Every structure is written in structure tokens, then in C-alpha cells.
Amino acid sequence: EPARVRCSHLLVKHSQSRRPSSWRQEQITRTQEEALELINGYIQKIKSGEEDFESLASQFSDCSSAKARGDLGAFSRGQMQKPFEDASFALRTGEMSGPVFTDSGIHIILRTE
Numbered sequence: 001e002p003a004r005v006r007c008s009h010l011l012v013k014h015s016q017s018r019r020p021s022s023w024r025q026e027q028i029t030r031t032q033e034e035a036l037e038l039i040n041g042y043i044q045k046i047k048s049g050e051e052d053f054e055s056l057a058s059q060f061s062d063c064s065s066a067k068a069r070g071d072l073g074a075f076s077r078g079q080m081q082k083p084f085e086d087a088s089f090a091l092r093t094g095e096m097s098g099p100v101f102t103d104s105g106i107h108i109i110l111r112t113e
């Protein structure tokens with residue numbers, strides 16, 4: 001395992017997220033159920049080729065990393081929330097995760113390095 005990985009992600013928050021606000025919306029109103037529906041629909045569009053991961057993250061991620069087209073930069077273990085970390089380190093470079101759940105919301109992760 002490398003000391004650090006670089007990943008991009010797309011976060012979809014919901015009304016029970018730790019911080020249910022984002023640069024996209026003053027208050028996150030969608031339900032947890034709707035957030036997972038959106039995540040799964042993004043996964044399906046990326047798998048079909050209809051959408052590009054980082055292009056989608058740049059406009060639809062609730063994380064401020066949307067400004068960097070979803071890029072979080074490099075990180076080691078012990079930094080990110082544990083479910084995010086474990087998913088990220090389990091990816092090969094070029095691989096995308098399925099839904100990943102944290103206190104922040106629901107993510108899809110693309111490992112880039």
C-alpha cells in the first residue's frame with residue numbers, strides 16, 4: 001500500500017448529514033434515500049459513458065472540492081473519515097468506488113494516484 005493516495009470524489013449530502021449545507025444549496029433538503037438515488041444515477045451515467053466523473057463533480061458535488069473538479073489531493077491514513085479512507089485505499093488507480101457512506105453524506109470516489 002502506498003503511503004498516500006490521490007482521489008477525486010463527488011459528495012451528495014442529505015438533510016441528516018453532519019453539515020447539511022453546501023456551496024450548492026443554503027440548506028440540504030433531500031432525503032437520505034434521494035441522495036443514494038442520485039449517487040446511483042451518477043454511477044450509472046459514468047458507467048454508460050454519458051457523463052465524465054470530474055465534470056459531474058465540478059458542478060454537482062456538495063463538497064467545496066467541486067472547485068477543483070472533485071480533487072482532494074493526496075492523503076494518508078488517519079486523516080479522512082474512516083469509511084472514506086478505507087474505500088480510497090482499496091481502489092486501484094483509475095478505479096471508481098460504489099456508494100461510500102460517511103457522516104458528511106454519500107460519496108463516489110475516483111482514485112487518480
Ligand SMILES: O=C(N[C@H](Cc1cccc(F)c1)C(=O)O)c1ccc2ccccc2c1
Binds near residue numbers: 024025038060
Ligand atoms: O434537479 C436537479 N439537480 C438536483 C437539485 C439541485 C440541488 C442543488 C443545486 C441545484 F441547482 C439543483 C441535484 O443536483 O441534486 C437538476 C435539474 C435540471 C438539470 C438539468 C441539466 C443537468 C442537471 C440538472 C439537475
